[PDB]
PDB file of C-alpha atoms in Angstrom:
ATOM      1  CA  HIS A   1      27.226 -27.699 -30.079  1.00 38.54           C
ATOM      2  CA  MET A   2      29.523 -28.667 -27.204  1.00 35.82           C
ATOM      3  CA  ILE A   3      31.496 -31.899 -26.892  1.00 35.32           C
ATOM      4  CA  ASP A   4      29.485 -34.914 -25.730  1.00 33.47           C
ATOM      5  CA  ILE A   5      32.367 -36.372 -23.734  1.00 30.44           C
ATOM      6  CA  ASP A   6      30.128 -39.017 -22.115  1.00 32.30           C
ATOM      7  CA  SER A   7      29.040 -40.446 -25.468  1.00 35.78           C
ATOM      8  CA  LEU A   8      32.596 -40.469 -26.830  1.00 36.40           C
ATOM      9  CA  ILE A   9      34.012 -42.324 -23.818  1.00 37.03           C
ATOM     10  CA  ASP A  10      31.185 -44.867 -24.004  1.00 37.31           C
ATOM     11  CA  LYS A  11      31.905 -45.702 -27.648  1.00 37.89           C
ATOM     12  CA  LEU A  12      35.606 -46.045 -26.819  1.00 34.81           C
ATOM     13  CA  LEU A  13      34.997 -48.303 -23.817  1.00 35.56           C
ATOM     14  CA  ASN A  14      32.532 -50.408 -25.815  1.00 35.06           C
ATOM     15  CA  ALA A  15      35.090 -50.825 -28.602  1.00 35.04           C
ATOM     16  CA  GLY A  16      37.615 -52.106 -26.076  1.00 34.43           C
ATOM     17  CA  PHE A  17      35.219 -54.463 -24.310  1.00 32.51           C
ATOM     18  CA  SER A  18      34.277 -56.038 -27.636  1.00 31.86           C
ATOM     19  CA  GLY A  19      37.820 -57.368 -27.892  1.00 30.38           C
ATOM     20  CA  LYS A  20      37.433 -56.656 -31.596  1.00 31.52           C
ATOM     21  CA  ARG A  21      39.734 -54.708 -33.895  1.00 29.74           C
ATOM     22  CA  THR A  22      38.011 -52.650 -36.585  1.00 29.08           C
ATOM     23  CA  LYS A  23      39.625 -50.702 -39.422  1.00 30.20           C
ATOM     24  CA  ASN A  24      37.235 -47.822 -38.804  1.00 29.59           C
ATOM     25  CA  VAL A  25      37.718 -46.057 -35.479  1.00 28.33           C
ATOM     26  CA  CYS A  26      34.496 -45.982 -33.445  1.00 29.38           C
ATOM     27  CA  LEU A  27      34.752 -42.176 -33.573  1.00 29.52           C
ATOM     28  CA  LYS A  28      34.370 -39.884 -36.591  1.00 32.19           C
ATOM     29  CA  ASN A  29      37.341 -37.761 -37.684  1.00 30.20           C
ATOM     30  CA  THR A  30      35.310 -34.684 -36.766  1.00 28.63           C
ATOM     31  CA  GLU A  31      34.969 -36.115 -33.261  1.00 28.53           C
ATOM     32  CA  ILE A  32      38.679 -36.959 -33.190  1.00 30.56           C
ATOM     33  CA  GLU A  33      39.317 -33.362 -34.275  1.00 32.06           C
ATOM     34  CA  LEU A  34      37.179 -31.962 -31.464  1.00 32.97           C
ATOM     35  CA  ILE A  35      38.838 -34.168 -28.841  1.00 35.35           C
ATOM     36  CA  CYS A  36      42.332 -33.036 -29.855  1.00 34.91           C
ATOM     37  CA  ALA A  37      41.320 -29.371 -29.767  1.00 34.63           C
ATOM     38  CA  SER A  38      39.682 -29.665 -26.350  1.00 37.23           C
ATOM     39  CA  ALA A  39      42.634 -31.569 -24.901  1.00 38.26           C
ATOM     40  CA  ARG A  40      45.093 -29.098 -26.421  1.00 39.10           C
ATOM     41  CA  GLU A  41      43.274 -26.212 -24.724  1.00 38.65           C
ATOM     42  CA  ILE A  42      43.639 -27.901 -21.335  1.00 37.63           C
ATOM     43  CA  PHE A  43      47.298 -28.859 -21.824  1.00 37.33           C
ATOM     44  CA  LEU A  44      48.286 -25.286 -22.696  1.00 37.94           C
ATOM     45  CA  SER A  45      46.279 -23.906 -19.765  1.00 39.14           C
ATOM     46  CA  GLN A  46      47.894 -26.211 -17.199  1.00 37.22           C
ATOM     47  CA  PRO A  47      51.608 -25.821 -16.360  1.00 36.10           C
ATOM     48  CA  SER A  48      54.530 -27.459 -18.173  1.00 36.78           C
ATOM     49  CA  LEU A  49      55.539 -28.866 -14.799  1.00 36.38           C
ATOM     50  CA  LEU A  50      52.558 -30.416 -13.033  1.00 33.13           C
ATOM     51  CA  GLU A  51      52.445 -30.287  -9.248  1.00 35.91           C
ATOM     52  CA  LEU A  52      50.060 -32.932  -7.973  1.00 36.10           C
ATOM     53  CA  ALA A  53      48.804 -33.829  -4.515  1.00 37.20           C
ATOM     54  CA  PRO A  54      48.481 -37.488  -3.450  1.00 39.94           C
ATOM     55  CA  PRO A  55      46.934 -39.990  -3.663  1.00 36.30           C
ATOM     56  CA  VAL A  56      47.675 -40.795  -7.309  1.00 36.52           C
ATOM     57  CA  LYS A  57      48.574 -43.822  -9.428  1.00 39.02           C
ATOM     58  CA  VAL A  58      51.473 -43.595 -11.877  1.00 38.30           C
ATOM     59  CA  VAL A  59      51.414 -45.417 -15.216  1.00 36.36           C
ATOM     60  CA  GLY A  60      54.387 -46.043 -17.500  1.00 40.35           C
ATOM     61  CA  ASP A  61      54.341 -46.963 -21.194  1.00 38.19           C
ATOM     62  CA  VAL A  62      51.113 -48.252 -22.694  1.00 38.46           C
ATOM     63  CA  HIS A  63      52.162 -48.189 -26.373  1.00 35.16           C
ATOM     64  CA  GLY A  64      48.801 -48.769 -28.055  1.00 33.65           C
ATOM     65  CA  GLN A  65      48.074 -51.892 -26.008  1.00 31.95           C
ATOM     66  CA  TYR A  66      44.463 -50.814 -25.536  1.00 33.58           C
ATOM     67  CA  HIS A  67      43.059 -53.977 -23.944  1.00 31.53           C
ATOM     68  CA  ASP A  68      45.820 -53.813 -21.328  1.00 33.07           C
ATOM     69  CA  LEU A  69      44.924 -50.166 -20.670  1.00 31.42           C
ATOM     70  CA  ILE A  70      41.385 -51.277 -19.886  1.00 35.65           C
ATOM     71  CA  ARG A  71      42.817 -53.985 -17.623  1.00 36.29           C
ATOM     72  CA  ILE A  72      44.713 -51.224 -15.820  1.00 37.89           C
ATOM     73  CA  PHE A  73      41.573 -49.148 -15.244  1.00 38.69           C
ATOM     74  CA  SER A  74      39.621 -52.239 -14.184  1.00 42.34           C
ATOM     75  CA  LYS A  75      42.276 -53.375 -11.705  1.00 43.67           C
ATOM     76  CA  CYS A  76      43.485 -50.003 -10.419  1.00 42.42           C
ATOM     77  CA  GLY A  77      40.185 -48.120 -10.613  1.00 39.12           C
ATOM     78  CA  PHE A  78      38.465 -46.012 -13.264  1.00 44.55           C
ATOM     79  CA  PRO A  79      38.663 -42.192 -13.257  1.00 44.50           C
ATOM     80  CA  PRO A  80      37.910 -40.035 -11.472  1.00 44.71           C
ATOM     81  CA  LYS A  81      37.812 -41.974  -8.182  1.00 45.23           C
ATOM     82  CA  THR A  82      41.381 -43.005  -8.889  1.00 44.88           C
ATOM     83  CA  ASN A  83      43.755 -40.158  -9.757  1.00 43.49           C
ATOM     84  CA  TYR A  84      46.168 -40.862 -12.605  1.00 40.78           C
ATOM     85  CA  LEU A  85      49.502 -39.610 -13.871  1.00 40.30           C
ATOM     86  CA  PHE A  86      50.722 -41.131 -17.129  1.00 37.88           C
ATOM     87  CA  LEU A  87      54.402 -40.917 -18.042  1.00 36.45           C
ATOM     88  CA  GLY A  88      53.950 -40.901 -21.818  1.00 35.54           C
ATOM     89  CA  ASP A  89      54.486 -43.212 -24.800  1.00 36.85           C
ATOM     90  CA  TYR A  90      50.815 -43.846 -25.541  1.00 36.13           C
ATOM     91  CA  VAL A  91      51.151 -44.807 -29.209  1.00 36.69           C
ATOM     92  CA  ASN A  92      53.276 -46.918 -31.598  1.00 34.48           C
ATOM     93  CA  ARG A  93      54.156 -50.640 -31.528  1.00 31.71           C
ATOM     94  CA  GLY A  94      50.762 -51.714 -30.165  1.00 31.59           C
ATOM     95  CA  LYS A  95      47.715 -52.786 -32.164  1.00 30.75           C
ATOM     96  CA  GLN A  96      45.260 -50.070 -31.094  1.00 29.73           C
ATOM     97  CA  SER A  97      47.155 -46.791 -30.703  1.00 27.00           C
ATOM     98  CA  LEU A  98      44.152 -44.717 -31.789  1.00 26.86           C
ATOM     99  CA  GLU A  99      41.667 -46.137 -29.266  1.00 28.33           C
ATOM    100  CA  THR A 100      44.344 -45.820 -26.580  1.00 29.79           C
ATOM    101  CA  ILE A 101      45.295 -42.162 -27.055  1.00 30.38           C
ATOM    102  CA  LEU A 102      41.665 -41.152 -27.667  1.00 30.73           C
ATOM    103  CA  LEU A 103      40.415 -42.663 -24.409  1.00 30.80           C
ATOM    104  CA  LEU A 104      43.254 -41.039 -22.475  1.00 33.77           C
ATOM    105  CA  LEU A 105      42.521 -37.655 -24.065  1.00 31.30           C
ATOM    106  CA  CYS A 106      38.789 -37.973 -23.354  1.00 30.34           C
ATOM    107  CA  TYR A 107      39.468 -38.701 -19.680  1.00 33.58           C
ATOM    108  CA  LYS A 108      41.790 -35.690 -19.609  1.00 31.75           C
ATOM    109  CA  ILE A 109      38.929 -33.608 -20.992  1.00 33.26           C
ATOM    110  CA  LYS A 110      36.273 -34.931 -18.609  1.00 34.35           C
ATOM    111  CA  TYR A 111      38.471 -34.895 -15.490  1.00 38.30           C
ATOM    112  CA  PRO A 112      41.136 -32.191 -16.083  1.00 39.36           C
ATOM    113  CA  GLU A 113      42.148 -32.014 -12.406  1.00 37.33           C
ATOM    114  CA  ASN A 114      42.180 -35.730 -11.610  1.00 33.84           C
ATOM    115  CA  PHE A 115      43.746 -37.075 -14.795  1.00 33.54           C
ATOM    116  CA  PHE A 116      47.182 -36.230 -16.179  1.00 31.68           C
ATOM    117  CA  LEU A 117      49.308 -37.154 -19.198  1.00 29.35           C
ATOM    118  CA  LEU A 118      53.017 -36.448 -19.663  1.00 20.86           C
ATOM    119  CA  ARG A 119      54.923 -36.406 -22.946  1.00 17.69           C
ATOM    120  CA  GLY A 120      56.944 -39.480 -23.873  1.00 16.51           C
ATOM    121  CA  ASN A 121      59.680 -39.717 -26.489  1.00 13.01           C
ATOM    122  CA  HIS A 122      57.228 -41.441 -28.835  1.00 13.17           C
ATOM    123  CA  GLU A 123      54.815 -38.487 -28.833  1.00 10.13           C
ATOM    124  CA  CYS A 124      56.421 -36.680 -31.772  1.00  9.97           C
ATOM    125  CA  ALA A 125      56.341 -36.675 -35.576  1.00  6.71           C
ATOM    126  CA  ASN A 126      59.743 -38.357 -35.988  1.00  6.59           C
ATOM    127  CA  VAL A 127      59.055 -41.479 -33.928  1.00  8.14           C
ATOM    128  CA  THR A 128      55.414 -42.013 -34.930  1.00  9.35           C
ATOM    129  CA  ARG A 129      56.568 -42.062 -38.560  1.00 11.15           C
ATOM    130  CA  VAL A 130      58.638 -45.146 -37.811  1.00  8.58           C
ATOM    131  CA  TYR A 131      56.786 -47.344 -35.330  1.00  9.51           C
ATOM    132  CA  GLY A 132      53.213 -47.488 -36.573  1.00  9.13           C
ATOM    133  CA  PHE A 133      51.059 -44.553 -35.484  1.00  8.32           C
ATOM    134  CA  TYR A 134      51.544 -42.524 -38.671  1.00  7.97           C
ATOM    135  CA  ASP A 135      50.660 -45.578 -40.734  1.00  8.69           C
ATOM    136  CA  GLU A 136      47.684 -46.363 -38.489  1.00 10.98           C
ATOM    137  CA  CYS A 137      46.425 -42.792 -38.809  1.00 10.13           C
ATOM    138  CA  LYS A 138      46.814 -42.905 -42.597  1.00  6.96           C
ATOM    139  CA  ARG A 139      45.208 -46.334 -42.875  1.00  5.51           C
ATOM    140  CA  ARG A 140      42.296 -45.955 -40.434  1.00  2.85           C
ATOM    141  CA  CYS A 141      41.770 -42.204 -40.708  1.00  3.65           C
ATOM    142  CA  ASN A 142      43.948 -39.822 -42.709  1.00  2.00           C
ATOM    143  CA  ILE A 143      47.222 -37.892 -42.629  1.00  2.58           C
ATOM    144  CA  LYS A 144      45.321 -34.752 -41.633  1.00  3.12           C
ATOM    145  CA  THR A 145      44.213 -36.612 -38.508  1.00  5.32           C
ATOM    146  CA  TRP A 146      47.811 -37.619 -37.754  1.00  5.16           C
ATOM    147  CA  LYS A 147      48.922 -33.989 -37.991  1.00  6.33           C
ATOM    148  CA  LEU A 148      46.211 -33.046 -35.493  1.00  3.81           C
ATOM    149  CA  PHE A 149      47.580 -35.578 -32.999  1.00  3.48           C
ATOM    150  CA  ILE A 150      51.118 -34.255 -33.490  1.00  2.00           C
ATOM    151  CA  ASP A 151      49.816 -30.733 -32.862  1.00  2.00           C
ATOM    152  CA  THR A 152      48.316 -32.142 -29.671  1.00  2.00           C
ATOM    153  CA  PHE A 153      51.431 -34.109 -28.668  1.00  2.00           C
ATOM    154  CA  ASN A 154      53.441 -30.890 -28.991  1.00  2.00           C
ATOM    155  CA  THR A 155      51.420 -29.298 -26.164  1.00  2.00           C
ATOM    156  CA  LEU A 156      51.815 -32.092 -23.595  1.00  2.00           C
ATOM    157  CA  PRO A 157      53.399 -31.202 -20.225  1.00  4.18           C
ATOM    158  CA  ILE A 158      56.932 -32.470 -19.630  1.00  3.83           C
ATOM    159  CA  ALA A 159      57.263 -33.321 -15.938  1.00  9.12           C
ATOM    160  CA  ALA A 160      55.356 -33.687 -12.676  1.00  9.28           C
ATOM    161  CA  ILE A 161      56.177 -33.378  -8.981  1.00  8.99           C
ATOM    162  CA  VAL A 162      54.102 -35.516  -6.617  1.00  8.96           C
ATOM    163  CA  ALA A 163      53.741 -34.180  -3.061  1.00  4.48           C
ATOM    164  CA  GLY A 164      56.901 -32.104  -3.504  1.00  3.10           C
ATOM    165  CA  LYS A 165      59.010 -35.250  -3.205  1.00  3.24           C
ATOM    166  CA  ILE A 166      58.562 -37.480  -6.261  1.00  2.00           C
ATOM    167  CA  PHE A 167      59.935 -36.148  -9.546  1.00  2.00           C
ATOM    168  CA  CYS A 168      58.063 -37.640 -12.500  1.00  2.12           C
ATOM    169  CA  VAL A 169      59.345 -37.558 -16.074  1.00  2.29           C
ATOM    170  CA  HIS A 170      59.293 -40.034 -18.965  1.00  3.00           C
ATOM    171  CA  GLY A 171      62.986 -40.492 -19.695  1.00  3.08           C
ATOM    172  CA  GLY A 172      65.122 -39.002 -16.959  1.00  5.09           C
ATOM    173  CA  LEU A 173      67.465 -36.222 -15.901  1.00  3.50           C
ATOM    174  CA  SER A 174      69.371 -33.595 -17.887  1.00  2.00           C
ATOM    175  CA  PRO A 175      72.917 -32.174 -17.675  1.00  2.43           C
ATOM    176  CA  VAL A 176      71.428 -28.752 -18.443  1.00  2.00           C
ATOM    177  CA  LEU A 177      68.636 -28.847 -15.860  1.00  2.00           C
ATOM    178  CA  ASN A 178      69.439 -25.964 -13.518  1.00  2.00           C
ATOM    179  CA  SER A 179      66.003 -25.293 -12.027  1.00  2.00           C
ATOM    180  CA  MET A 180      62.373 -26.433 -12.033  1.00  2.00           C
ATOM    181  CA  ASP A 181      61.496 -23.081 -13.605  1.00  3.86           C
ATOM    182  CA  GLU A 182      63.336 -24.211 -16.738  1.00  2.00           C
ATOM    183  CA  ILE A 183      60.792 -26.997 -17.158  1.00  2.00           C
ATOM    184  CA  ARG A 184      57.978 -24.562 -16.325  1.00  2.00           C
ATOM    185  CA  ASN A 185      59.251 -22.235 -19.054  1.00  2.00           C
ATOM    186  CA  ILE A 186      59.406 -24.768 -21.876  1.00  2.00           C
ATOM    187  CA  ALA A 187      57.528 -23.028 -24.690  1.00  2.00           C
ATOM    188  CA  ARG A 188      54.543 -24.914 -26.096  1.00  2.33           C
ATOM    189  CA  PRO A 189      53.616 -26.102 -28.619  1.00  2.20           C
ATOM    190  CA  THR A 190      56.990 -27.572 -29.571  1.00  4.81           C
ATOM    191  CA  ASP A 191      58.469 -30.476 -31.486  1.00  7.18           C
ATOM    192  CA  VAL A 192      61.085 -32.567 -29.697  1.00  6.78           C
ATOM    193  CA  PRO A 193      64.461 -30.927 -30.378  1.00  3.88           C
ATOM    194  CA  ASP A 194      67.525 -32.939 -31.377  1.00  3.24           C
ATOM    195  CA  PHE A 195      69.341 -31.587 -28.336  1.00  2.00           C
ATOM    196  CA  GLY A 196      68.767 -29.748 -25.069  1.00  2.00           C
ATOM    197  CA  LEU A 197      66.601 -29.998 -21.963  1.00  2.00           C
ATOM    198  CA  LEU A 198      63.462 -31.468 -23.539  1.00  2.00           C
ATOM    199  CA  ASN A 199      65.463 -33.972 -25.591  1.00  2.00           C
ATOM    200  CA  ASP A 200      67.250 -35.201 -22.463  1.00  2.00           C
ATOM    201  CA  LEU A 201      64.127 -35.419 -20.281  1.00  2.00           C
ATOM    202  CA  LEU A 202      62.497 -37.742 -22.820  1.00  2.00           C
ATOM    203  CA  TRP A 203      65.493 -39.830 -23.902  1.00  2.00           C
ATOM    204  CA  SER A 204      68.014 -40.113 -21.059  1.00  2.00           C
ATOM    205  CA  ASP A 205      68.596 -43.381 -19.189  1.00  2.00           C
ATOM    206  CA  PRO A 206      70.105 -44.197 -15.793  1.00  2.00           C
ATOM    207  CA  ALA A 207      73.253 -46.343 -15.696  1.00  2.00           C
ATOM    208  CA  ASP A 208      75.929 -47.426 -13.223  1.00  2.00           C
ATOM    209  CA  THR A 209      78.532 -45.434 -15.160  1.00  2.00           C
ATOM    210  CA  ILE A 210      81.728 -43.895 -13.789  1.00  2.00           C
ATOM    211  CA  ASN A 211      81.004 -40.389 -15.079  1.00  2.00           C
ATOM    212  CA  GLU A 212      77.962 -38.300 -14.175  1.00  2.00           C
ATOM    213  CA  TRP A 213      77.083 -37.944 -17.844  1.00  2.00           C
ATOM    214  CA  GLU A 214      78.038 -39.993 -20.897  1.00  2.00           C
ATOM    215  CA  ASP A 215      76.611 -40.337 -24.400  1.00  2.00           C
ATOM    216  CA  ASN A 216      73.648 -42.710 -24.495  1.00  2.00           C
ATOM    217  CA  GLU A 217      74.622 -45.734 -26.572  1.00  2.00           C
ATOM    218  CA  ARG A 218      70.953 -46.148 -27.498  1.00  2.00           C
ATOM    219  CA  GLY A 219      71.588 -43.241 -29.862  1.00  2.00           C
ATOM    220  CA  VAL A 220      69.819 -40.271 -28.238  1.00  2.00           C
ATOM    221  CA  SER A 221      70.734 -37.922 -25.368  1.00  2.00           C
ATOM    222  CA  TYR A 222      72.804 -39.115 -22.405  1.00  2.00           C
ATOM    223  CA  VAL A 223      73.108 -41.704 -19.651  1.00  2.00           C
ATOM    224  CA  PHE A 224      73.384 -40.509 -16.053  1.00  2.00           C
ATOM    225  CA  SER A 225      75.134 -42.109 -13.083  1.00  2.00           C
ATOM    226  CA  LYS A 226      74.057 -42.736  -9.492  1.00  2.00           C
ATOM    227  CA  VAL A 227      75.956 -39.586  -8.514  1.00  2.00           C
ATOM    228  CA  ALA A 228      73.878 -37.507 -10.937  1.00  2.00           C
ATOM    229  CA  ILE A 229      70.727 -38.871  -9.301  1.00  2.00           C
ATOM    230  CA  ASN A 230      71.998 -38.211  -5.779  1.00  2.00           C
ATOM    231  CA  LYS A 231      72.968 -34.673  -6.785  1.00  2.00           C
ATOM    232  CA  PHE A 232      69.596 -34.005  -8.416  1.00  2.00           C
ATOM    233  CA  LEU A 233      67.623 -35.284  -5.425  1.00  2.00           C
ATOM    234  CA  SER A 234      69.783 -33.267  -3.034  1.00  2.00           C
ATOM    235  CA  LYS A 235      69.571 -30.063  -5.079  1.00  2.00           C
ATOM    236  CA  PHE A 236      65.772 -29.927  -5.318  1.00  2.00           C
ATOM    237  CA  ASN A 237      65.027 -31.851  -2.109  1.00  2.00           C
ATOM    238  CA  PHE A 238      63.272 -34.781  -3.784  1.00  2.00           C
ATOM    239  CA  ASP A 239      63.070 -38.343  -2.453  1.00  2.00           C
ATOM    240  CA  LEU A 240      62.379 -40.270  -5.652  1.00  2.00           C
ATOM    241  CA  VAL A 241      62.781 -40.074  -9.411  1.00  2.00           C
ATOM    242  CA  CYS A 242      59.902 -41.880 -11.117  1.00  2.00           C
ATOM    243  CA  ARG A 243      60.300 -42.586 -14.832  1.00  2.00           C
ATOM    244  CA  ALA A 244      59.492 -45.030 -17.629  1.00  2.00           C
ATOM    245  CA  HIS A 245      61.157 -45.306 -21.041  1.00  2.00           C
ATOM    246  CA  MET A 246      62.389 -48.887 -20.563  1.00  2.00           C
ATOM    247  CA  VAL A 247      60.780 -52.327 -20.588  1.00  2.00           C
ATOM    248  CA  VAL A 248      61.346 -54.221 -17.344  1.00  2.00           C
ATOM    249  CA  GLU A 249      60.450 -57.863 -16.646  1.00  2.00           C
ATOM    250  CA  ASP A 250      58.373 -57.155 -13.524  1.00  2.00           C
ATOM    251  CA  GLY A 251      56.796 -53.929 -14.750  1.00  2.00           C
ATOM    252  CA  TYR A 252      58.931 -51.970 -12.310  1.00  2.00           C
ATOM    253  CA  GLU A 253      62.547 -51.776 -11.165  1.00  2.00           C
ATOM    254  CA  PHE A 254      64.375 -49.703  -8.551  1.00  2.00           C
ATOM    255  CA  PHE A 255      67.873 -48.269  -8.977  1.00  2.00           C
ATOM    256  CA  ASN A 256      70.524 -46.563  -6.827  1.00  2.00           C
ATOM    257  CA  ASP A 257      69.158 -47.829  -3.501  1.00  2.00           C
ATOM    258  CA  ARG A 258      65.520 -47.119  -4.379  1.00  2.00           C
ATOM    259  CA  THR A 259      66.122 -43.484  -5.359  1.00  2.00           C
ATOM    260  CA  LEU A 260      64.979 -44.089  -8.932  1.00  2.00           C
ATOM    261  CA  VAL A 261      62.230 -46.364 -10.224  1.00  2.00           C
ATOM    262  CA  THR A 262      61.312 -47.408 -13.751  1.00  2.00           C
ATOM    263  CA  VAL A 263      57.613 -48.038 -14.343  1.00  2.00           C
ATOM    264  CA  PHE A 264      56.469 -49.891 -17.459  1.00  2.00           C
ATOM    265  CA  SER A 265      52.856 -50.774 -18.153  1.00  2.00           C
ATOM    266  CA  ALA A 266      52.862 -52.631 -21.472  1.00  2.00           C
ATOM    267  CA  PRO A 267      52.778 -56.377 -20.652  1.00  2.00           C
ATOM    268  CA  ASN A 268      54.657 -58.587 -23.132  1.00  2.00           C
ATOM    269  CA  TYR A 269      56.149 -55.531 -24.843  1.00  2.00           C
ATOM    270  CA  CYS A 270      56.524 -55.910 -28.627  1.00  2.00           C
ATOM    271  CA  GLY A 271      55.125 -59.417 -28.134  1.00  2.00           C
ATOM    272  CA  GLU A 272      58.712 -60.448 -27.395  1.00  2.00           C
ATOM    273  CA  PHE A 273      59.654 -59.631 -23.795  1.00  2.00           C
ATOM    274  CA  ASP A 274      56.889 -61.401 -21.823  1.00  2.00           C
ATOM    275  CA  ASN A 275      57.218 -58.714 -19.154  1.00  2.00           C
ATOM    276  CA  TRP A 276      54.657 -57.773 -16.536  1.00  2.00           C
ATOM    277  CA  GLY A 277      53.122 -54.315 -16.430  1.00  2.00           C
ATOM    278  CA  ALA A 278      53.126 -52.222 -13.261  1.00  2.00           C
ATOM    279  CA  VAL A 279      51.233 -49.265 -11.840  1.00  2.00           C
ATOM    280  CA  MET A 280      52.743 -47.348  -8.925  1.00  2.00           C
ATOM    281  CA  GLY A 281      50.284 -46.123  -6.318  1.00  2.00           C
ATOM    282  CA  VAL A 282      51.411 -43.144  -4.261  1.00  2.00           C
ATOM    283  CA  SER A 283      49.552 -42.918  -0.952  1.00  2.00           C
ATOM    284  CA  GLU A 284      48.519 -39.734   0.842  1.00  2.00           C
ATOM    285  CA  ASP A 285      51.466 -40.429   3.155  1.00  2.00           C
ATOM    286  CA  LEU A 286      53.801 -40.848   0.160  1.00  2.00           C
ATOM    287  CA  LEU A 287      53.930 -44.644   0.441  1.00  2.00           C
ATOM    288  CA  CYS A 288      54.725 -46.269  -2.902  1.00  2.00           C
ATOM    289  CA  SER A 289      53.031 -49.571  -3.716  1.00  2.00           C
ATOM    290  CA  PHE A 290      52.818 -51.629  -6.897  1.00  2.00           C
ATOM    291  CA  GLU A 291      49.880 -53.304  -8.602  1.00  3.64           C
ATOM    292  CA  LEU A 292      50.987 -55.728 -11.308  1.00  2.00           C
ATOM    293  CA  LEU A 293      49.524 -57.048 -14.556  1.00  2.00           C
ATOM    294  CA  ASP A 294      50.649 -60.337 -16.084  1.00  2.00           C
ATOM    295  CA  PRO A 295      51.187 -60.747 -19.845  1.00  2.00           C
ATOM    296  CA  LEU A 296      48.191 -62.314 -21.598  1.00  2.00           C
ATOM    297  CA  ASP A 297      47.942 -63.574 -25.168  1.00  2.00           C
ATOM    298  CA  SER A 298      45.429 -62.269 -27.707  1.00  2.00           C
ATOM    299  CA  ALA A 299      42.889 -64.914 -26.690  1.00  2.00           C
ATOM    300  CA  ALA A 300      43.067 -64.397 -22.919  1.00  2.00           C
ATOM    301  CA  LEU A 301      42.840 -60.631 -23.385  1.00  2.00           C
ATOM    302  CA  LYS A 302      39.671 -61.093 -25.422  1.00  2.00           C
ATOM    303  CA  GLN A 303      38.282 -63.250 -22.614  1.00  2.00           C
ATOM    304  CA  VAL A 304      39.087 -60.604 -19.999  1.00  2.00           C
ATOM    305  CA  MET A 305      37.349 -58.030 -22.210  1.00  2.00           C
ATOM    306  CA  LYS A 306      34.457 -60.449 -22.572  1.00  2.00           C
ATOM    307  CA  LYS A 307      34.464 -60.853 -18.789  1.00  2.00           C
ATOM    308  CA  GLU A 308      34.807 -57.163 -17.913  1.00  2.00           C
ATOM    309  CA  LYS A 309      31.754 -56.259 -20.021  1.00  2.00           C
ATOM    310  CA  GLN A 310      29.635 -57.524 -17.119  1.00  2.00           C
TER     311      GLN A 310
END
C-alpha cells in the first residue's frame, strides 16, 4: 500500500496546532520509516546542486522549533502555493526536532518540485549525537529510527542556485571550490567529512579578515574574507551569496556591501539570544524582501497555535 501523505501531514499539523508536547510521536515508526525512504528516493533523484526558478522563499535554521516553523508557514504561506528552499539545520537544540523534520520531509514528498531542503552542518551523526536529536530519537522512538534519519540526512542536496544569480548554501564558500560541477558531483549518500569541499560548505563563516582564507576559530573549516566573496561572485557570475549557519538578532544580516546575507529562522535561539527569525522572499524579478518573526515565549506560542487552529 502506497504512502498516505495527506493523512501523515494532517497528523503532524494537528500535533503542532495542539501546542502540546507528547513523548510519543503522532506517527508510527513504520510511518517514519516510509517517509524517510520516500524522501531519500527523491533526494537522490534530484541534483546535488539545485537550480530553482523564482519566486521562492528562503528559510534559515529552524532547529526543532516546530511551533515557529508553523508560524513561518502561516505567515509566509503554506506549500505548495509558496515555493520554499530551506538551508538546513532542521534538528537539535529545539524541543520538537522530530515533528519538525518529519513535516519538512512530508512536504518534500508531496511537492517535490515546489519544496526543497538543503543539508546543514547539524544533519549528520556526529552533531546529532551531541545536541539532542539522537537522544530524542532514542527516547521517543528508537536508535534504529535515528539511523534511518542519518541515512536520509546523508542524501540531502548541498547547494542551490536561484535564478542563476543567488548562490544558496548552509555555511558558505570553500577554498577548494573550483566549479559548480564539483558540487553536482558530490557522491551521495555521504557522511560529512572532516575536511574538504562538503565540510567547508557546511561549516565556513564570512569574516572581515585580511587573508582570503584563515582557520575558523569556531573549530571547523575556514573563515573567508570579503575578497573571497567578491572573487566567487565574479568567477561564477552570481549577485548574492545566501547562507545561514549563524544566529542574528534581526533574523537576517547583510555583509560585504549586501553581497552576502545570513538568514536565521529560529526566534530566541537556544532560549538565550532573543533574536528574530527571518524568511527571505525572492521575487520573479530577483527582488529580495524579508518577512520577520518575533521571539515568543512558550505561552504565547501556545496561544498562536491555539489561534491558528481556526
